[PDB]
């Protein structure tokens, strides 16, 4: 019933994010926009694990080691993890960014649901499905930018010959 | 007959992924109930167990031949909850015999508090048992006939026709 | 009443996109007909114009409260086609008065060849006019009541309730 | 009912082809497979325009100038163009490959429908919507390949310095 619409939300995030590979920054614009529009969370922050430390632009950087913290505990685990009572923060959906795998490429956390003051178990797995398209968009757009910068700087080194 | 066949089929098409399936499936089945029964509306209670006693707490409410599942999502703290001794919901939970109930006003045991919680006006009802494990899990009812005061027998056949399916879904 | 409202809503939640819309919407509306009217099945004929004369060629056929549009998609070369003088399909095409038809056997003009084309056994029917432009483009019928030989009046109300929408879709 | 599937088949071709950017050949495998599965055509061939000439692997190449031919006429136009009577070929859905635009990047042609011996008008626009995902996959995976080969051969020129 309403059931189709949140699948077509995945349609929207797909047809969007797969067309935004040209730049990860604009990709962040579209992602933050679509997420603040659909997740109903008043705010959010997206960690990205690196060996033993998470990385997040929320463009001032924010950092937190995989051993330390609760979201860091999610970095240790990759568990989707609702926090219906946060302690106007009042709840947090702390789930891994993921991508190709359940392996922790990062740790997203939504804050302050619209419709139902608490995050539901419904406010979990759907965010993970959204994080399928987002995770592919991240891993592959970064896959794009790394090849860009590196292989471009290579011909920058080509200079003398 | 084919009706029930591709109706429950098209009903399973209507479902899409979210959380989030079987309950809305029973919802759509309530829709089909209030349709082929030509009812104004319908409703269902979970009969979920606690203290060793299943309790017929209300779930779907003011279900029409539609009424969105989102509309029917009553808070468990706020949901009406029937113990086995109260209502024909808990009485079917207590007896599980198939029950034509031509007039709840006469074929009693019924709790008319459902009229309070739903705002619907009860006149008559029917029911069949629905169970999972040792536990009971559901009770289902048609509400206000549109065209006439009462069903004839093949409508009761329709009532089995989709309450058997509701029996099939919440398991 | 909410029924038809969220019925047509949920009916639009039934569908993605194909070719392949409005006729199939009228199809699902025929489903809602054979449901809320508790009919065994239903059918619709396009009344598409030619030679200045609209022709009530059969389209949807053996529609149940279900039945896929492919199940009902007869070849235009093979479709049964009614001129204005044949059948109550072409007679509603010829008169456009609302028609309760309690018994086609008595309330005649009806073409029982539809029983041949569909394999269904006609007993009674009802109809309302449906037009695009100056042209007429549709005729609609419910088929075999499940619980009784005939409708009571508010079922006729449901009949208007969705044939009016059928008028609304193919325009 | 039946009326809600073919778009999710576009979800299938999306989740497939957008994940197969790493190589064009595998992209062709998934495309030929998904197309011979969904189009109900017994066979097909996909032209790709280059200024005034189409290009096709159907891996022996096949070529036809944009001015010459009926499919070439489609290259001249980009009109979707059913041919219910082809002359076991019996029909051809000749529609442009397209991509970002109605501009003719190429000219696909499906052959021999299952379910209804003729191609329908239904057997047109759906192929175009399928060609949205396929066209983006082509333009952008080839966008990926050109960057690969070129920027790689650049560091191959970097070798001396």
């Amino acid at each position: 019933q309403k059931l189709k619409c949140e699948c077509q939300a995945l349609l929207q995030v797909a047809k969007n994010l797969f067309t935004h590979l040209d730049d990860v920054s604009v990709l962040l614009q579209e992602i933050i926009t679509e997420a603040r529009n659909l997740s109903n969370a008043e705010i959010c922050s997206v960690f990205l694990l690196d060996q033993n430390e998470l990385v997040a632009k929320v463009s001032y950087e924010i950092r937190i080691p995989a051993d330390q913290g609760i979201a860091g505990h999610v970095a240790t685990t990759g568990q989707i993890l609702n926090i219906p009572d946060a302690y106007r923060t009042r709840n947090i959906l702390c789930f891994p960014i993921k991508n190709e795998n359940q392996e922790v490429i990062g740790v997203a956390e939504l804050v302050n649901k619209i419709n139902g003051p608490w995050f539901s178990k419904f406010d979990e797995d759907l965010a993970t499905a959204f994080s399928i398209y987002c995770g592919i968009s991240i891993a592959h757009s970064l896959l794009y930018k790394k090849v860009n910068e590196a292989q471009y700087r290579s011909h920058l080194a080509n200079e003398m010959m | 007959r084919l009706e029930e066949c591709n109706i429950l089929f098209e009903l399973l098409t209507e479902i899409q992924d979210e959380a989030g399936s079987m309950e809305k499936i029973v919802h759509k089945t309530l829709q089909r109930l209030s349709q082929l029964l030509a009812a104004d509306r319908c409703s269902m209670f979970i009969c979920r167990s606690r203290n060793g006693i299943p309790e017929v707490a209300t779930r779907l409410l003011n279900v029409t031949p539609t009424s969105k599942f989102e509309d029917n999502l009553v808070n468990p703290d706020k949901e009406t909850v029937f113990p086995l001794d109260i209502g024909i919901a808990g009485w079917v939970a207590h007896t599980k015999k198939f029950f034509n109930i031509p007039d709840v006003k006469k074929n009693n045991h019924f709790s008319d508090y459902l009229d309070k919680k739903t705002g619907y006006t009860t006149v008559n009802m029917m029911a069949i048992p629905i169970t999972q494990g040792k536990e009971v899990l559901a009770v289902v009812m048609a509400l206000n006939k549109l065209n006439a005061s009462e069903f004839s027998k093949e409508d009761e056949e329709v009532f089995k026709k989709y309450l058997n399916f509701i029996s099939l879904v919440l398991r």
Side-chain angles (χ1 to χ4, degrees), chain A, chain B:
Chain A
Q1 190 171 358
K2 186 182 70 66
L3 296 168
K4 181 180 67 64
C5 295
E6 290 176 348
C7 295
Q8 290 180 334
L10 296 177
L11 274 66
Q12 185 65 60
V13 69
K15 64 180 294 179
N16 289 338
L17 300 186
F18 287 98
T19 55
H20 298 294
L21 271 64
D22 291 344
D23 185 6
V24 69
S25 296
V26 175
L27 179 66
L28 265 64
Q29 297 297 99
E30 183 68 14
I31 288 170
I32 294 170
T33 300
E34 188 70 13
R36 293 186 298 104
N37 287 337
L38 274 67
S39 65
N40 290 283
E42 291 178 351
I43 59 172
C44 180
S45 64
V46 287
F47 299 155
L48 293 175
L49 180 61
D50 187 4
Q51 183 61 60
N52 193 29
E53 61 185 343
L54 294 168
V55 174
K57 299 293 181 63
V58 61
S59 63
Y60 59 92
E61 295 174 350
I62 295 96
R63 302 293 178 84
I64 185 69
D67 57 353
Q68 186 175 355
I70 297 170
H73 177 63
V74 174
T76 302
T77 60
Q79 295 178 337
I80 296 98
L81 195 148
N82 191 341
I83 300 101
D85 184 67
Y87 300 137
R88 298 296 181 191
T89 303
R90 58 178 181 183
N91 60 34
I92 293 102
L93 174 61
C94 188
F95 68 94
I97 300 295
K98 62 181 66 181
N99 54 31
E100 297 300 322
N101 296 132
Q102 184 62 259
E103 295 175 350
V104 180
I105 194 65
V107 176
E109 58 187 343
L110 293 173
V111 176
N112 290 338
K113 184 63 174 172
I114 302 301
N115 190 31
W118 66 92
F119 279 147
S120 297
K121 294 176 179 178
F122 166 77
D123 291 341
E124 294 179 352
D125 59 353
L126 187 145
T128 298
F130 185 82
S131 178
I132 294 170
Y133 296 90
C134 291
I136 302 302
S137 65
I138 290 171
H140 192 62
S141 178
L142 293 178
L143 185 147
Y144 175 76
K145 180 175 290 296
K146 297 294 179 64
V147 173
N148 285 284
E149 295 300 322
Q151 197 68 262
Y152 182 84
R153 287 172 294 182
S154 295
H155 79 78
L156 295 177
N158 195 342
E159 179 65 16
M160 289 173 63
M161 292 294 179
Chain B
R1 70 185 187 280
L2 199 148
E3 307 99 358
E4 178 183 0
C5 297
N6 286 335
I7 277 173
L8 294 177
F9 171 81
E10 206 286 332
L11 187 150
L12 291 177
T13 62
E14 294 174 353
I15 307 303
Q16 289 294 316
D17 187 5
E18 284 183 350
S21 66
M22 305 299 288
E23 294 177 351
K24 290 182 181 292
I25 294 174
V26 177
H27 173 277
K28 306 294 176 63
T29 306
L30 292 179
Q31 295 180 337
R32 300 295 185 269
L33 285 170
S34 185
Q35 288 174 334
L36 282 175
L37 295 171
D40 178 69
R41 66 172 62 197
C42 288
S43 63
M44 177 187 73
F45 310 159
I46 189 168
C47 187
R48 66 184 187 275
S49 65
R50 179 175 291 178
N51 192 31
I53 295 170
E55 63 186 344
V56 190
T58 60
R59 293 286 293 175
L60 295 170
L61 293 175
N62 285 333
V63 173
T64 317
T66 61
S67 177
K68 298 175 179 177
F69 178 83
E70 300 303 320
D71 291 343
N72 301 134
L73 181 63
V74 178
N75 189 338
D77 288 344
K78 293 191 296 185
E79 66 184 342
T80 300
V81 178
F82 289 160
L84 297 173
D85 59 353
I86 294 172
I88 298 171
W91 179 256
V92 174
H94 184 62
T95 58
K96 295 182 175 73
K97 293 163 61 182
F98 177 81
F99 285 157
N100 186 341
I101 300 165
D103 190 6
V104 296
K105 299 171 182 176
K106 291 162 60 182
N107 187 340
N108 58 34
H109 302 291
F110 182 80
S111 178
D112 58 352
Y113 177 79
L114 298 177
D115 291 344
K116 304 293 179 64
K117 181 62 173 173
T118 58
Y120 167 78
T121 301
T122 303
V123 175
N124 58 35
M125 187 179 74
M126 294 176 184
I128 195 168
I130 299 169
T131 57
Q132 171 65 268
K134 65 178 180 179
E135 297 83 357
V136 182
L137 267 68
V139 173
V140 174
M141 67 189 85
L143 301 178
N144 280 343
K145 186 69 175 296
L146 294 172
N147 68 346
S149 64
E150 64 183 343
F151 297 161
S152 63
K153 182 63 174 173
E154 295 83 357
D155 282 342
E156 299 179 354
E157 180 181 3
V158 177
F159 185 81
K160 293 178 179 177
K161 178 185 299 299
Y162 294 138
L163 267 76
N164 289 336
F165 178 78
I166 293 172
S167 299
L168 295 174
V169 176
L170 291 173
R171 294 180 183 175

